[PDB]
Amino acid sequence: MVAPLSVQGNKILANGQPASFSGMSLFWSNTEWGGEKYYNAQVVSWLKSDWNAKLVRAAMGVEDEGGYLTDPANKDRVTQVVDAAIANDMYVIIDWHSHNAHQYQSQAIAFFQEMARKYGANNHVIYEIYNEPLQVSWSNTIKPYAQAVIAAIRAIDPDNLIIVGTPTWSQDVDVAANDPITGYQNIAYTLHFYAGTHGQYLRDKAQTALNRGIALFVTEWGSVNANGDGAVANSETNAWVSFMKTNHISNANWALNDKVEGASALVPGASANGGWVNSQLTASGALAKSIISGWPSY
């Protein structure tokens, strides 16, 4: 049984102590976007057995073409991954993979209510309600949306973590920390980085947020450039890894996918059902597996 997770100040706790978990993000769930083939039980069990992953993220597209708003089959793919995470005793992040979620509050509420009713009794579930807000106000745009969605989840699932996206593609955790979400337990805040583009400047905003007493979760990170492509930046990735290990920050690498781009963990044609030998991982994938499998035990 995975531990129920909670927040106290800047820490996510398991069994009364800071704990952190490392794994992979799936790519966009969207129909015809390629990554959908990896949303299955075999992939989830392989990530556990071969990568020693403790976490998987289901990245459910929303207003993007082929996403949940126009194609509900996206949610069936999410369900497959959630069921498989629970069966494999892995945490699972249910991600509303939107850039504009404040426009779709009632849809988000209805979706997270269903997810909470069905899955809320499990320790495994982590709700991520707003992937990557753009250059929009924390106080006036994101936080009202978050308050409403959190109220709806908490009425059903009083405990399990809810992770809230932050301004500028989930960079401005320092801004969120000056106006945190109150009145509900076990709320944390999203930080996203790509080590080819982001370094100490972004680490400093993260440190500021931590010092101001909010907890961070890296629901998405890449070893490559911020556009999802380019060379693996080994040195800067190791810097980010140390930062996350020091501060007990959970992390999901982008992405378990076979598209030709730097962020893909897999070569094109890597099997939809797992079993990948090392020579079928990309430089990004091999580094991701190394970080995940070497993540602290707790």
PDB file of C-alpha atoms in Angstrom:
ATOM      1  CA  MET A   1       0.000   0.000   0.000  1.00  0.00           C
ATOM      2  CA  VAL A   2       1.414   3.389  -1.029  1.00  0.00           C
ATOM      3  CA  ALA A   3       1.238   5.926   1.804  1.00  0.00           C
ATOM      4  CA  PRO A   4      -1.460   8.620   1.908  1.00  0.00           C
ATOM      5  CA  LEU A   5       0.255  11.895   1.046  1.00  0.00           C
ATOM      6  CA  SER A   6      -0.261  15.209   2.809  1.00  0.00           C
ATOM      7  CA  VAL A   7       1.228  18.736   2.951  1.00  0.00           C
ATOM      8  CA  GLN A   8       2.797  20.483   5.955  1.00  0.00           C
ATOM      9  CA  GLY A   9       4.460  23.807   5.082  1.00  0.00           C
ATOM     10  CA  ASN A  10       6.883  23.205   2.179  1.00  0.00           C
ATOM     11  CA  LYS A  11       6.861  19.402   2.651  1.00  0.00           C
ATOM     12  CA  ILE A  12       4.864  16.555   1.189  1.00  0.00           C
ATOM     13  CA  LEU A  13       4.650  13.927   3.971  1.00  0.00           C
ATOM     14  CA  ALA A  14       4.277  10.152   4.048  1.00  0.00           C
ATOM     15  CA  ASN A  15       3.940   8.474   7.470  1.00  0.00           C
ATOM     16  CA  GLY A  16       4.937  11.687   9.222  1.00  0.00           C
ATOM     17  CA  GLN A  17       8.182  12.359   7.289  1.00  0.00           C
ATOM     18  CA  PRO A  18       9.085  14.195   4.005  1.00  0.00           C
ATOM     19  CA  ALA A  19       8.886  11.775   1.077  1.00  0.00           C
ATOM     20  CA  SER A  20       9.248  12.061  -2.688  1.00  0.00           C
ATOM     21  CA  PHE A  21       8.536   9.927  -5.734  1.00  0.00           C
ATOM     22  CA  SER A  22       9.934   9.807  -9.274  1.00  0.00           C
ATOM     23  CA  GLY A  23       8.422   8.534 -12.532  1.00  0.00           C
ATOM     24  CA  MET A  24       7.350   9.331 -16.089  1.00  0.00           C
ATOM     25  CA  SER A  25       4.716  11.508 -17.707  1.00  0.00           C
ATOM     26  CA  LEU A  26       2.871  10.026 -20.605  1.00  0.00           C
ATOM     27  CA  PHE A  27       2.530  12.317 -23.632  1.00  0.00           C
ATOM     28  CA  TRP A  28      -0.765  14.037 -24.564  1.00  0.00           C
ATOM     29  CA  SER A  29      -3.660  11.529 -24.384  1.00  0.00           C
ATOM     30  CA  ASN A  30      -5.298  13.227 -27.372  1.00  0.00           C
ATOM     31  CA  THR A  31      -6.754  11.101 -30.155  1.00  0.00           C
ATOM     32  CA  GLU A  32      -4.388  10.896 -33.171  1.00  0.00           C
ATOM     33  CA  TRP A  33      -1.460  12.512 -31.249  1.00  0.00           C
ATOM     34  CA  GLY A  34       0.532   9.252 -31.161  1.00  0.00           C
ATOM     35  CA  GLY A  35       1.252   8.986 -27.407  1.00  0.00           C
ATOM     36  CA  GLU A  36      -2.235   7.520 -26.775  1.00  0.00           C
ATOM     37  CA  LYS A  37      -0.915   4.011 -27.635  1.00  0.00           C
ATOM     38  CA  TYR A  38       1.177   3.958 -24.416  1.00  0.00           C
ATOM     39  CA  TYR A  39      -1.870   4.533 -22.147  1.00  0.00           C
ATOM     40  CA  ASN A  40      -2.167   0.887 -21.048  1.00  0.00           C
ATOM     41  CA  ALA A  41      -1.526  -1.546 -18.165  1.00  0.00           C
ATOM     42  CA  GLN A  42       1.513  -3.165 -19.772  1.00  0.00           C
ATOM     43  CA  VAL A  43       3.410   0.147 -19.983  1.00  0.00           C
ATOM     44  CA  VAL A  44       2.554   1.005 -16.348  1.00  0.00           C
ATOM     45  CA  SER A  45       3.694  -2.396 -15.030  1.00  0.00           C
ATOM     46  CA  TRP A  46       6.891  -2.209 -17.164  1.00  0.00           C
ATOM     47  CA  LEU A  47       7.752   1.272 -15.800  1.00  0.00           C
ATOM     48  CA  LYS A  48       7.490  -0.266 -12.334  1.00  0.00           C
ATOM     49  CA  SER A  49       9.324  -3.547 -13.007  1.00  0.00           C
ATOM     50  CA  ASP A  50      12.087  -2.235 -15.340  1.00  0.00           C
ATOM     51  CA  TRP A  51      12.484   1.464 -14.376  1.00  0.00           C
ATOM     52  CA  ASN A  52      11.490   1.133 -10.686  1.00  0.00           C
ATOM     53  CA  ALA A  53       9.074   4.058 -11.207  1.00  0.00           C
ATOM     54  CA  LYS A  54       6.891   5.003  -8.233  1.00  0.00           C
ATOM     55  CA  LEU A  55       4.728   7.450 -10.201  1.00  0.00           C
ATOM     56  CA  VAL A  56       3.014   7.867 -13.590  1.00  0.00           C
ATOM     57  CA  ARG A  57       1.266  10.935 -15.043  1.00  0.00           C
ATOM     58  CA  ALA A  58      -1.755  10.745 -17.352  1.00  0.00           C
ATOM     59  CA  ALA A  59      -1.625  13.942 -19.437  1.00  0.00           C
ATOM     60  CA  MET A  60      -5.222  14.404 -20.549  1.00  0.00           C
ATOM     61  CA  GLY A  61      -5.574  16.993 -23.331  1.00  0.00           C
ATOM     62  CA  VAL A  62      -8.484  19.421 -22.951  1.00  0.00           C
ATOM     63  CA  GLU A  63      -8.948  22.284 -25.493  1.00  0.00           C
ATOM     64  CA  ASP A  64      -6.179  21.065 -27.836  1.00  0.00           C
ATOM     65  CA  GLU A  65      -7.330  19.206 -30.954  1.00  0.00           C
ATOM     66  CA  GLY A  66      -8.384  15.633 -30.173  1.00  0.00           C
ATOM     67  CA  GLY A  67      -8.710  16.449 -26.447  1.00  0.00           C
ATOM     68  CA  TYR A  68     -11.263  15.646 -23.765  1.00  0.00           C
ATOM     69  CA  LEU A  69     -13.650  18.544 -24.476  1.00  0.00           C
ATOM     70  CA  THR A  70     -14.319  17.292 -28.035  1.00  0.00           C
ATOM     71  CA  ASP A  71     -13.422  13.595 -27.564  1.00  0.00           C
ATOM     72  CA  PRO A  72     -14.370  11.918 -24.231  1.00  0.00           C
ATOM     73  CA  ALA A  73     -12.487   8.741 -25.172  1.00  0.00           C
ATOM     74  CA  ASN A  74      -9.477  10.612 -23.709  1.00  0.00           C
ATOM     75  CA  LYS A  75     -10.955   9.792 -20.286  1.00  0.00           C
ATOM     76  CA  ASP A  76     -11.060   6.039 -21.052  1.00  0.00           C
ATOM     77  CA  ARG A  77      -7.297   6.211 -21.665  1.00  0.00           C
ATOM     78  CA  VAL A  78      -6.826   8.032 -18.337  1.00  0.00           C
ATOM     79  CA  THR A  79      -8.945   5.352 -16.566  1.00  0.00           C
ATOM     80  CA  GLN A  80      -6.778   2.555 -17.983  1.00  0.00           C
ATOM     81  CA  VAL A  81      -3.637   4.172 -16.559  1.00  0.00           C
ATOM     82  CA  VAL A  82      -5.247   4.954 -13.167  1.00  0.00           C
ATOM     83  CA  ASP A  83      -6.509   1.385 -12.746  1.00  0.00           C
ATOM     84  CA  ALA A  84      -3.027   0.063 -13.709  1.00  0.00           C
ATOM     85  CA  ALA A  85      -1.217   2.405 -11.276  1.00  0.00           C
ATOM     86  CA  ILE A  86      -3.438   1.216  -8.403  1.00  0.00           C
ATOM     87  CA  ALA A  87      -2.906  -2.451  -9.371  1.00  0.00           C
ATOM     88  CA  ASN A  88       0.892  -1.846  -9.441  1.00  0.00           C
ATOM     89  CA  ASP A  89       0.935   0.199  -6.218  1.00  0.00           C
ATOM     90  CA  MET A  90       2.178   3.338  -8.034  1.00  0.00           C
ATOM     91  CA  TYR A  91       1.043   6.922  -7.558  1.00  0.00           C
ATOM     92  CA  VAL A  92      -0.876   8.353 -10.503  1.00  0.00           C
ATOM     93  CA  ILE A  93      -1.298  12.007 -11.472  1.00  0.00           C
ATOM     94  CA  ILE A  94      -4.583  12.761 -13.214  1.00  0.00           C
ATOM     95  CA  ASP A  95      -3.598  15.837 -15.234  1.00  0.00           C
ATOM     96  CA  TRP A  96      -6.029  18.318 -16.819  1.00  0.00           C
ATOM     97  CA  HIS A  97      -3.499  19.090 -19.513  1.00  0.00           C
ATOM     98  CA  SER A  98      -4.765  22.564 -20.370  1.00  0.00           C
ATOM     99  CA  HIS A  99      -3.262  26.000 -21.042  1.00  0.00           C
ATOM    100  CA  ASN A 100      -6.637  27.723 -20.583  1.00  0.00           C
ATOM    101  CA  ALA A 101      -8.472  25.754 -17.871  1.00  0.00           C
ATOM    102  CA  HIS A 102     -10.085  28.888 -16.369  1.00  0.00           C
ATOM    103  CA  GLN A 103     -12.292  28.956 -19.489  1.00  0.00           C
ATOM    104  CA  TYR A 104     -13.517  25.405 -18.732  1.00  0.00           C
ATOM    105  CA  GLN A 105     -14.305  25.515 -15.003  1.00  0.00           C
ATOM    106  CA  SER A 106     -17.615  23.615 -15.163  1.00  0.00           C
ATOM    107  CA  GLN A 107     -16.072  20.887 -17.348  1.00  0.00           C
ATOM    108  CA  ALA A 108     -13.125  20.588 -14.943  1.00  0.00           C
ATOM    109  CA  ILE A 109     -15.424  20.381 -11.927  1.00  0.00           C
ATOM    110  CA  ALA A 110     -17.566  17.656 -13.543  1.00  0.00           C
ATOM    111  CA  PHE A 111     -14.465  15.681 -14.536  1.00  0.00           C
ATOM    112  CA  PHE A 112     -12.677  15.894 -11.157  1.00  0.00           C
ATOM    113  CA  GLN A 113     -15.921  15.076  -9.347  1.00  0.00           C
ATOM    114  CA  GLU A 114     -16.223  11.848 -11.362  1.00  0.00           C
ATOM    115  CA  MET A 115     -12.548  11.034 -10.745  1.00  0.00           C
ATOM    116  CA  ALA A 116     -12.881  11.722  -6.999  1.00  0.00           C
ATOM    117  CA  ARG A 117     -16.088   9.634  -6.655  1.00  0.00           C
ATOM    118  CA  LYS A 118     -14.534   6.698  -8.453  1.00  0.00           C
ATOM    119  CA  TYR A 119     -10.954   6.841  -7.188  1.00  0.00           C
ATOM    120  CA  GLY A 120     -10.844   9.074  -4.071  1.00  0.00           C
ATOM    121  CA  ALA A 121     -10.593   6.193  -1.518  1.00  0.00           C
ATOM    122  CA  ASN A 122      -7.210   5.149  -3.009  1.00  0.00           C
ATOM    123  CA  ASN A 123      -3.911   6.594  -1.677  1.00  0.00           C
ATOM    124  CA  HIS A 124      -2.518   6.440  -5.218  1.00  0.00           C
ATOM    125  CA  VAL A 125      -4.395   9.409  -6.722  1.00  0.00           C
ATOM    126  CA  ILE A 126      -2.980  12.910  -7.221  1.00  0.00           C
ATOM    127  CA  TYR A 127      -5.182  15.529  -8.915  1.00  0.00           C
ATOM    128  CA  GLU A 128      -3.449  18.079 -11.207  1.00  0.00           C
ATOM    129  CA  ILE A 129      -6.132  20.580 -12.149  1.00  0.00           C
ATOM    130  CA  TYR A 130      -4.311  23.059 -14.449  1.00  0.00           C
ATOM    131  CA  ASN A 131      -1.164  21.867 -16.267  1.00  0.00           C
ATOM    132  CA  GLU A 132       0.381  25.135 -17.535  1.00  0.00           C
ATOM    133  CA  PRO A 133      -1.348  28.496 -17.238  1.00  0.00           C
ATOM    134  CA  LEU A 134       0.108  31.053 -19.643  1.00  0.00           C
ATOM    135  CA  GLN A 135       1.063  34.661 -18.815  1.00  0.00           C
ATOM    136  CA  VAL A 136      -2.072  35.226 -16.707  1.00  0.00           C
ATOM    137  CA  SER A 137      -2.762  36.516 -13.173  1.00  0.00           C
ATOM    138  CA  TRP A 138      -2.366  34.101 -10.281  1.00  0.00           C
ATOM    139  CA  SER A 139      -4.786  36.059  -8.057  1.00  0.00           C
ATOM    140  CA  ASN A 140      -7.356  37.022 -10.692  1.00  0.00           C
ATOM    141  CA  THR A 141      -7.314  34.086 -13.151  1.00  0.00           C
ATOM    142  CA  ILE A 142      -5.757  30.888 -11.737  1.00  0.00           C
ATOM    143  CA  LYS A 143      -6.659  31.085  -8.020  1.00  0.00           C
ATOM    144  CA  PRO A 144     -10.478  31.614  -8.503  1.00  0.00           C
ATOM    145  CA  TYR A 145     -10.499  28.586 -10.820  1.00  0.00           C
ATOM    146  CA  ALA A 146      -8.435  26.544  -8.355  1.00  0.00           C
ATOM    147  CA  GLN A 147     -10.648  27.483  -5.371  1.00  0.00           C
ATOM    148  CA  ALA A 148     -13.767  26.284  -7.231  1.00  0.00           C
ATOM    149  CA  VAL A 149     -12.229  23.002  -8.469  1.00  0.00           C
ATOM    150  CA  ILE A 150     -10.605  22.245  -5.085  1.00  0.00           C
ATOM    151  CA  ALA A 151     -13.977  22.845  -3.270  1.00  0.00           C
ATOM    152  CA  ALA A 152     -15.588  20.287  -5.608  1.00  0.00           C
ATOM    153  CA  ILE A 153     -12.853  17.641  -5.125  1.00  0.00           C
ATOM    154  CA  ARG A 154     -12.583  18.151  -1.336  1.00  0.00           C
ATOM    155  CA  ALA A 155     -16.321  17.652  -0.802  1.00  0.00           C
ATOM    156  CA  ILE A 156     -15.737  14.068  -2.077  1.00  0.00           C
ATOM    157  CA  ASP A 157     -12.038  13.331  -1.401  1.00  0.00           C
ATOM    158  CA  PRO A 158     -10.984  15.250   1.713  1.00  0.00           C
ATOM    159  CA  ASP A 159      -7.368  14.018   1.670  1.00  0.00           C
ATOM    160  CA  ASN A 160      -5.560  13.248  -1.597  1.00  0.00           C
ATOM    161  CA  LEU A 161      -3.056  15.785  -3.007  1.00  0.00           C
ATOM    162  CA  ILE A 162      -4.186  18.508  -5.387  1.00  0.00           C
ATOM    163  CA  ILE A 163      -1.451  20.187  -7.433  1.00  0.00           C
ATOM    164  CA  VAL A 164      -2.162  23.661  -8.833  1.00  0.00           C
ATOM    165  CA  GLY A 165      -0.475  25.133 -11.906  1.00  0.00           C
ATOM    166  CA  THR A 166       1.249  28.517 -11.721  1.00  0.00           C
ATOM    167  CA  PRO A 167       1.802  31.446 -14.124  1.00  0.00           C
ATOM    168  CA  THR A 168       4.219  31.445 -17.100  1.00  0.00           C
ATOM    169  CA  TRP A 169       4.019  27.724 -17.928  1.00  0.00           C
ATOM    170  CA  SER A 170       4.068  26.843 -14.219  1.00  0.00           C
ATOM    171  CA  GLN A 171       7.245  28.844 -13.418  1.00  0.00           C
ATOM    172  CA  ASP A 172       5.892  31.576 -11.110  1.00  0.00           C
ATOM    173  CA  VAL A 173       5.682  29.483  -7.920  1.00  0.00           C
ATOM    174  CA  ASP A 174       7.094  32.516  -6.003  1.00  0.00           C
ATOM    175  CA  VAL A 175       4.004  34.551  -7.052  1.00  0.00           C
ATOM    176  CA  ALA A 176       1.611  31.789  -5.916  1.00  0.00           C
ATOM    177  CA  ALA A 177       3.471  31.590  -2.585  1.00  0.00           C
ATOM    178  CA  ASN A 178       2.538  35.248  -1.882  1.00  0.00           C
ATOM    179  CA  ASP A 179      -1.188  34.412  -2.241  1.00  0.00           C
ATOM    180  CA  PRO A 180      -1.587  30.704  -1.342  1.00  0.00           C
ATOM    181  CA  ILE A 181      -4.796  28.710  -1.524  1.00  0.00           C
ATOM    182  CA  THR A 182      -6.323  28.484   1.967  1.00  0.00           C
ATOM    183  CA  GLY A 183      -9.233  26.691   3.671  1.00  0.00           C
ATOM    184  CA  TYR A 184      -8.310  23.214   2.353  1.00  0.00           C
ATOM    185  CA  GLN A 185      -5.556  20.766   3.330  1.00  0.00           C
ATOM    186  CA  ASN A 186      -2.977  19.080   1.134  1.00  0.00           C
ATOM    187  CA  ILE A 187      -2.627  21.629  -1.682  1.00  0.00           C
ATOM    188  CA  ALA A 188       0.728  21.889  -3.508  1.00  0.00           C
ATOM    189  CA  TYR A 189       1.948  23.937  -6.490  1.00  0.00           C
ATOM    190  CA  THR A 190       3.340  23.022  -9.914  1.00  0.00           C
ATOM    191  CA  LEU A 191       6.887  23.715 -11.080  1.00  0.00           C
ATOM    192  CA  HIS A 192       7.902  22.826 -14.661  1.00  0.00           C
ATOM    193  CA  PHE A 193      11.456  23.079 -16.047  1.00  0.00           C
ATOM    194  CA  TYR A 194      13.434  22.024 -19.126  1.00  0.00           C
ATOM    195  CA  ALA A 195      17.155  21.845 -18.308  1.00  0.00           C
ATOM    196  CA  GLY A 196      18.250  23.043 -21.795  1.00  0.00           C
ATOM    197  CA  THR A 197      16.524  26.354 -21.079  1.00  0.00           C
ATOM    198  CA  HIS A 198      15.951  26.764 -17.311  1.00  0.00           C
ATOM    199  CA  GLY A 199      18.582  26.778 -14.557  1.00  0.00           C
ATOM    200  CA  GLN A 200      19.437  28.763 -11.462  1.00  0.00           C
ATOM    201  CA  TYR A 201      17.058  31.665 -12.159  1.00  0.00           C
ATOM    202  CA  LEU A 202      14.078  29.281 -11.988  1.00  0.00           C
ATOM    203  CA  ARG A 203      15.655  27.368  -9.060  1.00  0.00           C
ATOM    204  CA  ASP A 204      15.775  30.697  -7.164  1.00  0.00           C
ATOM    205  CA  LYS A 205      12.034  31.335  -7.681  1.00  0.00           C
ATOM    206  CA  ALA A 206      11.423  27.753  -6.471  1.00  0.00           C
ATOM    207  CA  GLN A 207      13.617  28.361  -3.383  1.00  0.00           C
ATOM    208  CA  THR A 208      11.734  31.585  -2.679  1.00  0.00           C
ATOM    209  CA  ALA A 209       8.413  29.659  -2.845  1.00  0.00           C
ATOM    210  CA  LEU A 210       9.750  26.943  -0.484  1.00  0.00           C
ATOM    211  CA  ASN A 211      11.059  29.607   1.958  1.00  0.00           C
ATOM    212  CA  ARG A 212       7.574  31.185   1.881  1.00  0.00           C
ATOM    213  CA  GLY A 213       6.115  27.859   3.018  1.00  0.00           C
ATOM    214  CA  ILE A 214       4.383  26.260   0.010  1.00  0.00           C
ATOM    215  CA  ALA A 215       5.119  22.754  -1.277  1.00  0.00           C
ATOM    216  CA  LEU A 216       6.200  22.130  -4.882  1.00  0.00           C
ATOM    217  CA  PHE A 217       5.645  19.183  -7.207  1.00  0.00           C
ATOM    218  CA  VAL A 218       7.425  18.905 -10.555  1.00  0.00           C
ATOM    219  CA  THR A 219       4.578  17.284 -12.496  1.00  0.00           C
ATOM    220  CA  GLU A 220       6.582  17.812 -15.691  1.00  0.00           C
ATOM    221  CA  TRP A 221      10.265  18.311 -16.543  1.00  0.00           C
ATOM    222  CA  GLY A 222      12.527  17.721 -19.533  1.00  0.00           C
ATOM    223  CA  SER A 223      16.288  17.260 -19.875  1.00  0.00           C
ATOM    224  CA  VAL A 224      16.152  19.088 -23.219  1.00  0.00           C
ATOM    225  CA  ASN A 225      15.070  22.591 -24.346  1.00  0.00           C
ATOM    226  CA  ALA A 226      11.760  24.184 -23.309  1.00  0.00           C
ATOM    227  CA  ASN A 227      10.180  23.499 -26.734  1.00  0.00           C
ATOM    228  CA  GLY A 228      10.465  19.737 -26.091  1.00  0.00           C
ATOM    229  CA  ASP A 229      13.408  19.293 -28.515  1.00  0.00           C
ATOM    230  CA  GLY A 230      17.238  19.553 -28.655  1.00  0.00           C
ATOM    231  CA  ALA A 231      20.239  17.943 -27.004  1.00  0.00           C
ATOM    232  CA  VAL A 232      20.170  16.432 -23.524  1.00  0.00           C
ATOM    233  CA  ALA A 233      21.616  18.960 -21.050  1.00  0.00           C
ATOM    234  CA  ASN A 234      23.300  16.552 -18.615  1.00  0.00           C
ATOM    235  CA  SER A 235      25.019  18.975 -16.266  1.00  0.00           C
ATOM    236  CA  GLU A 236      21.987  21.222 -15.745  1.00  0.00           C
ATOM    237  CA  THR A 237      19.716  18.131 -15.335  1.00  0.00           C
ATOM    238  CA  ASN A 238      21.966  16.852 -12.527  1.00  0.00           C
ATOM    239  CA  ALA A 239      21.694  20.287 -10.873  1.00  0.00           C
ATOM    240  CA  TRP A 240      17.893  20.122 -10.967  1.00  0.00           C
ATOM    241  CA  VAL A 241      17.940  16.539  -9.692  1.00  0.00           C
ATOM    242  CA  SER A 242      20.060  17.533  -6.644  1.00  0.00           C
ATOM    243  CA  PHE A 243      17.727  20.472  -5.960  1.00  0.00           C
ATOM    244  CA  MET A 244      14.693  18.148  -6.058  1.00  0.00           C
ATOM    245  CA  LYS A 245      16.373  15.478  -3.884  1.00  0.00           C
ATOM    246  CA  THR A 246      17.443  18.076  -1.270  1.00  0.00           C
ATOM    247  CA  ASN A 247      13.900  19.531  -1.059  1.00  0.00           C
ATOM    248  CA  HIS A 248      11.971  16.225  -1.339  1.00  0.00           C
ATOM    249  CA  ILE A 249      10.281  17.247  -4.586  1.00  0.00           C
ATOM    250  CA  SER A 250       8.401  14.600  -6.607  1.00  0.00           C
ATOM    251  CA  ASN A 251       9.000  14.579 -10.371  1.00  0.00           C
ATOM    252  CA  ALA A 252       7.634  13.194 -13.673  1.00  0.00           C
ATOM    253  CA  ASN A 253       9.802  13.364 -16.813  1.00  0.00           C
ATOM    254  CA  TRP A 254       8.325  14.399 -20.191  1.00  0.00           C
ATOM    255  CA  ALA A 255       7.648  12.184 -22.075  1.00  0.00           C
ATOM    256  CA  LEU A 256       7.041   8.446 -22.466  1.00  0.00           C
ATOM    257  CA  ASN A 257       6.589   8.671 -26.238  1.00  0.00           C
ATOM    258  CA  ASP A 258       8.303   7.842 -29.586  1.00  0.00           C
ATOM    259  CA  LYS A 259       7.856  11.086 -31.548  1.00  0.00           C
ATOM    260  CA  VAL A 260      11.062  12.389 -33.125  1.00  0.00           C
ATOM    261  CA  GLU A 261      11.883  15.130 -30.603  1.00  0.00           C
ATOM    262  CA  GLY A 262      14.488  15.389 -27.861  1.00  0.00           C
ATOM    263  CA  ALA A 263      11.955  15.010 -25.056  1.00  0.00           C
ATOM    264  CA  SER A 264      10.747  11.568 -26.282  1.00  0.00           C
ATOM    265  CA  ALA A 265      12.086   8.766 -24.027  1.00  0.00           C
ATOM    266  CA  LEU A 266      11.706   6.141 -26.821  1.00  0.00           C
ATOM    267  CA  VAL A 267      12.935   5.570 -30.374  1.00  0.00           C
ATOM    268  CA  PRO A 268      10.161   5.558 -33.082  1.00  0.00           C
ATOM    269  CA  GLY A 269       8.307   2.235 -33.062  1.00  0.00           C
ATOM    270  CA  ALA A 270       9.162   1.333 -29.473  1.00  0.00           C
ATOM    271  CA  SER A 271       6.441  -1.158 -28.528  1.00  0.00           C
ATOM    272  CA  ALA A 272       3.127   0.185 -27.239  1.00  0.00           C
ATOM    273  CA  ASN A 273       3.190  -2.574 -24.586  1.00  0.00           C
ATOM    274  CA  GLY A 274       6.616  -1.941 -23.042  1.00  0.00           C
ATOM    275  CA  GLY A 275       9.556  -4.308 -22.674  1.00  0.00           C
ATOM    276  CA  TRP A 276      11.991  -1.775 -24.228  1.00  0.00           C
ATOM    277  CA  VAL A 277      15.660  -2.810 -24.252  1.00  0.00           C
ATOM    278  CA  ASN A 278      18.110  -0.017 -23.405  1.00  0.00           C
ATOM    279  CA  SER A 279      19.037   0.539 -27.101  1.00  0.00           C
ATOM    280  CA  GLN A 280      15.422   1.587 -27.746  1.00  0.00           C
ATOM    281  CA  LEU A 281      15.645   4.552 -25.311  1.00  0.00           C
ATOM    282  CA  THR A 282      16.778   7.968 -26.494  1.00  0.00           C
ATOM    283  CA  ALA A 283      19.447   9.963 -24.607  1.00  0.00           C
ATOM    284  CA  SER A 284      16.572  11.630 -22.730  1.00  0.00           C
ATOM    285  CA  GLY A 285      14.894   8.278 -21.934  1.00  0.00           C
ATOM    286  CA  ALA A 286      18.097   6.648 -20.668  1.00  0.00           C
ATOM    287  CA  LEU A 287      18.829   9.617 -18.396  1.00  0.00           C
ATOM    288  CA  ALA A 288      15.190   9.572 -17.185  1.00  0.00           C
ATOM    289  CA  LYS A 289      15.369   5.878 -16.378  1.00  0.00           C
ATOM    290  CA  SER A 290      18.667   6.461 -14.496  1.00  0.00           C
ATOM    291  CA  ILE A 291      17.205   9.253 -12.379  1.00  0.00           C
ATOM    292  CA  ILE A 292      13.958   7.398 -11.683  1.00  0.00           C
ATOM    293  CA  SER A 293      15.535   4.079 -10.777  1.00  0.00           C
ATOM    294  CA  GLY A 294      18.130   5.823  -8.531  1.00  0.00           C
ATOM    295  CA  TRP A 295      15.525   8.004  -6.717  1.00  0.00           C
ATOM    296  CA  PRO A 296      15.704   7.742  -2.848  1.00  0.00           C
ATOM    297  CA  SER A 297      13.858   4.838  -1.160  1.00  0.00           C
ATOM    298  CA  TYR A 298      12.288   6.469   1.952  1.00  0.00           C
TER     299      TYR A 298
END
